Design goal:
This protein is mostly helical. Helix content is 62%, strand content 0%. It binds ligand EUO. It is found in: Nucleus.
């Protein structure tokens, strides 16, 4: 696959900022607070959140788009596994993942 260029990285920053600004993004902005879900980190093996992804973008951690998409998909998969399908948290993953897909297609 094609390495992420400096120009690609500016696009990833734009995509990440779009997700961080979405009104349904709140549960994903930062790592789950263990005090608000004391079982969360025993349930979810590989936590992920948008602030961790922002740190990784700023550090040029990602070499291929597939790696960035994989971290984003972890956010949504973790949410749907931890929460029941009628939870407001689950709803956020449904909305934000479709929004991410729209933005990802534009990024290409
Ligand atoms: C009750 N279920 C939950 C609770 C939370 C949660 C709680 C407190 C929090 N403080 C800072 C982030 C943060 C996230 N996040 C989810 S999530 C990421 O959508 O799977 N599900």
């Amino acid at each position: 696959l094609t390495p992420l260029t400096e120009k690609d990285y500016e696009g990833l920053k734009r995509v990440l900022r779009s997700l961080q600004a979405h009104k349904m993004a709140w549960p994903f902005l930062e790592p789950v607070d263990p005090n608000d879900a004391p079982d969360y980190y025993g349930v979810i093996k590989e936590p992920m959140d948008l602030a961790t992804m922002e740190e990784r973008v700023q550090r040029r951690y990602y070499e291929k788009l597939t790696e960035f998409v994989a971290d984003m998909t972890k956010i949504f998969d973790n949410c749907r596994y931890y929460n029941p399908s009628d939870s407001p948290f689950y709803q956020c993953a449904e909305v934000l993942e479709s929004f991410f897909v729209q933005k990802l297609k534009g990024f290409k």
